């Protein structure tokens, strides 16, 4: 709800590079500063002989908004034999998928082609690059002697990637075995330690992987999408992965054990070609220490009020319970052909409400279909299906639409304010934007009239504008406020009070404030530090019965307040906001004796 969409950090890459196609953050433990990782898969690098090879750029967070290519590979194509190239990096889509963990960066080229040792070939084997400090290695999750379509030759390893707790990499290899697909995982240390620059196939000792299955599973694409988290009780994160055409195109998501590559859970879609498994994610959305399972089905057709099907997209949300089972609901999209279920990214506790929130996005929604990202808040009851905040793309299509929301990543408190920020990519316009999270203020407000019953003849207090005494009452209001993260101790508030609110609506005003001789009064509040309510006592008085004849309707005393958004903002303009679930007024009433 607090995402700042007025003053976001926008970055861009070279035209036609598909900058924004994939995003992540780079926050090393080795530095006090932050950089963003934004992919540019069809970038023109300086590598000899290579066209649109692709890259990932590091963008500085602290202004100076320039994005510098990561030199993962400064070289051209290696040869197999004299005048017979080994490999083909042109148009490989390097940077199609980028992920990080601590001080390390992983990025891959799923459409890297390779010549086999035995036969002249151009097979989409795929390849990844991994960096640790200055150490750079190539990782070939699917390059082995199993060099054909029924093996790993068409694997496209690196199509999808993710990092587990501890320090392990999960990679999707969707083309293995005539596209049954395959999950592969390896320790980071193994990938780097065993690297040998002139070996096409490197064996690793603790490598986990799925294996070839029966033909009934052909063309299922396992590894198309991945996510991680522990579901099998304790230990290392398990491997969550989507298979877009499992179960005869209904689609499925499988979760495999974190110690050995063996299935724990089996989730499935309801509708053919809805692509259940297209995208996956996991996080403890209800705050009960159990990662949940989020499954995208982007071209789900729901049934409308007219009895007909409508392509709107879906995300299935399954909550992990202590019993080992799951419970579940469904979030459908909002517009036709706006692929809502295509992108899922955990926000983390974006508003600091105690539960993680999540971003779900439709790359082709809205009039002027720039792409829409929906922010859904978490509760102990699971995800609130009703969005709280909607984030939208800002650039016109050139050819393909910006597809804002195509790629996303949150759960990272890049700014000082201890709320995770959000990167949303828009490759159709070669852009990416990092939206900061504003601090959220909770306000404890009070209002009380002590003379609960007003004696109209109790003419004991003076009325400042005259020589006469009037019946009057003490209207006190108070405010206290605090919040998390980085916010000033002093918060200005505008407070306005009304008397006899339900009669001032075109009728007699039976009570006025004594000093202003008016139904209204305002105050500049400067509530600060937290735990203390700042109070103000106003005195109101009754008007004479001769005209002010209504002695039955209660006099409504009303107070409302608003945060000074500017005199609350820090150095960078990250204004605090008030929480969306906190009311900003109080109603009280006085009776006539």
């Amino acid at each position, epitope marked *: 709800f607090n995402l700042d969409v007025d003053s976001p950090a926008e970055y861009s890459g070279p035209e036609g590079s598909y900058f924004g196609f994939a995003v992540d953050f780079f926050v090393p433990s080795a*530095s*006090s500063r932050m950089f963003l990782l934004v992919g540019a898969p069809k970038a023109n690098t300086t590598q000899p002989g290579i066209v649109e090879g692709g890259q990932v750029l590091k963008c*500085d967070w602290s202004s100076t908004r320039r994005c*510098q290519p990561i030199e993962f590979d400064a070289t051209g194509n290696r040869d197999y034999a004299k005048d017979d190239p080994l490999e083909f990096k042109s148009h490989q889509w390097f940077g199609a998928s980028v992920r990080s963990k601590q001080d390390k960066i992983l990025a891959c080229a799923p459409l890297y082609h390779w010549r086999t040792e035995m036969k002249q070939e151009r097979e989409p084997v795929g390849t990844c690059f991994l960096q640790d400090g200055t150490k750079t290695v190539e990782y070939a999750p699917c390059r082995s002697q199993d060099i054909d379509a029924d093996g790993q030759g068409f694997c496209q390893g690196g199509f999808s990637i993710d990092f587990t707790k501890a320090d392990r990499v999960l990679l999707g290899g969707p083309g293995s075995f005539y596209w049954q697909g395959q999950l592969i995982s390896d320790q980071v240390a193994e990938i780097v330690s065993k690297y040998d620059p002139n070996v096409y196939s490197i064996k690793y000792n603790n490598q986990l992987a799925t294996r070839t299955a029966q033909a009934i599973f052909d063309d299922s694409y396992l590894g198309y999408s991945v996510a991680v988290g522990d579901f099998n009780g304790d230990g290392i994160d398990d491997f969550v992965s989507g298979v877009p055409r499992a179960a005869r195109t209904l689609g499925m998501v499988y979760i495999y054990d974190g110690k050995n590559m063996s299935s724990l859970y089996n989730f499935t879609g309801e509708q053919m070609a809805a692509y259940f498994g297209f995208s996956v994610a996991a996080t403890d959305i209800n705050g009960d220490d159990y990662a949940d399972v989020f499954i995208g089905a982007p071209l789900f057709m729901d049934r409308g009020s007219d009895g007909k099907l409508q392509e709107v997209g879906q995300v299935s949300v399954s909550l992990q319970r202590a019993s080992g089972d799951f419970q579940t609901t469904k979030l459908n999209g909002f517009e036709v052909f706006a692929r809502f279920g295509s992108a899922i990214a955990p926000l983390g506790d974006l508003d600091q409400d105690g539960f993680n929130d999540i971003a779900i996005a439709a790359p082709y929604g809205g009039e002027d279909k720039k792409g829409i990202v929906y922010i859904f808040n978490g509760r102990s009851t699971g995800l609130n299906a009703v969005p709280s905040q909607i984030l939208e793309g800002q650039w016109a299509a050139r050819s393909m639409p910006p597809s804002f929301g195509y790629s996303m990543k949150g759960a990272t408190d890049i700014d000082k304010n201890g709320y995770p920020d959000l990167i949303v990519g828009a490759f159709g316009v070669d852009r990416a934007i990092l939206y900061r999270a504003r601090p959220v203020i909770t306000v404890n407000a009070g209002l009380e009239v002590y003379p609960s019953i007003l004696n109209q003849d109790n003419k004991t207090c003076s009325l400042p504008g005259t020589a006469l005494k009037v019946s009057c009452f003490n209207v006190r209001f108070c405010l206290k406020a605090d919040g998390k993260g980085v916010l000033p101790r002093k918060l200005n508030f505008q407070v306005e009070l009304l008397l006899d609110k339900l009669k001032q609506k075109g009728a007699i005003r039976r009570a006025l404030f004594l000093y202003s001789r008016s139904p209204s009064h305002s105050k500049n509040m400067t509530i600060s530090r937290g735990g203390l309510m700042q109070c103000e006592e106003l005195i109101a008085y009754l008007r004479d019965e001769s005209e002010f004849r209504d002695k039955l309707t209660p006099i409504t005393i009303f107070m409302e307040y608003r945060l000074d958004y500017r005199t609350a903002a820090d150095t960078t303009g990250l204004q605090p906001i008030l929480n969306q679930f906190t009311p900003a007024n109080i109603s009280r009433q006085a009776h006539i004796l």
Partner: antibody, heavy 117, light 107 residues
Framework: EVQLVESGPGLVKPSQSLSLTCSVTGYYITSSYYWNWIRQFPGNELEWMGYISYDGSNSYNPSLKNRISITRDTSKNQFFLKLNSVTTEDIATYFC??????????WGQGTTLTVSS | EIVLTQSPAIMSAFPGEKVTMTCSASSSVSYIHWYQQKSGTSPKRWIYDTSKLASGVPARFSGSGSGTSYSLTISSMEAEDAATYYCHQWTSNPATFGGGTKLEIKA
């Protein structure tokens, strides 16, 4: 490594235009990295003249605003700094540096530009 | 824009002594670079990313600072530490440099 040499400096007259280059060898640097330019007045601190990258735009410390322009060549790994309206306060050492990250290094080997009679 | 200032302009510091080089900003920077250049030769920088040894730099050089207040601490000095140090900031359109502070040799 980054090997840097500079156009031989000359002796110019007040308000004479002059082109001084940064010739970089060892690897391709025209689109792979961001470059800057430095002005060193001997006896004091370094100052800065400008920048250029794959993106041909610059910025300038607005003294002789828009009297200095930076050009990037392609196949030659050659950057050009063009000085218009040189003044006698521009007698300084000029060179290029290589970095995008807020830091700099790989500075040139010494230049002596003189504006005189 | 702002200009970083410095206080230890000239010091007759000796090998073995602890010495600090400093800077100060008129507005938040949240970053510093420590550049090294001898007037007659071709050495490279000391510290980058506020506090991180540049390639080839000995343990003696340790950076610090935040906000507007920055420094470089030189632990017990090396024979060649008697050099001129410069601060640098590129967080705005011009580059900003410190005026330069130096250590010298006399005995």
């Amino acid at each position: 490594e980054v090997q840097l040499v500079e156009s031989g400096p000359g002796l110019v007259k007040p308000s004479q235009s002059l082109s001084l280059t940064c010739s970089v060898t060892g690897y391709y640097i025209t689109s792979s990295y961001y470059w800057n330019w430095i002005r060193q007045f001997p006896g004091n601190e370094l100052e800065w003249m400008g920048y250029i990258s794959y993106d041909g735009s610059n910025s300038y410390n607005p003294s002789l605003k828009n009297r200095i322009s930076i050009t990037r060549d392609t196949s030659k790994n050659q950057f050009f700094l063009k000085l218009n309206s040189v003044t006698t306060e521009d007698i300084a050492t000029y060179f290029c540096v290589r970095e995008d990250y807020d830091s700099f290094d790989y500075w040139g080997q010494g230049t002596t530009l003189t504006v005189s009679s | 824009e702002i200009v970083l200032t410095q206080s230890p302009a000239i010091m007759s510091a000796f090998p073995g002594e602890k010495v600090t080089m400093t800077c100060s900003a008129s507005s938040s920077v949240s970053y510093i670079h420590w550049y090294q250049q001898k007037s007659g030769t071709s050495p490279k920088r000391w510290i980058y990313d506020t506090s991180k040894l540049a390639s080839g730099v000995p343990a003696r050089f340790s950076g610090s600072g935040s906000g507007t207040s920055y420094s470089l601490t030189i632990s017990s000095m090396e024979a060649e530490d008697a050099a001129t140090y410069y601060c640098h900031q590129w967080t705005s359109n011009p580059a900003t440099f410190g005026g330069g502070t130096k250590l010298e040799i006399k005995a």
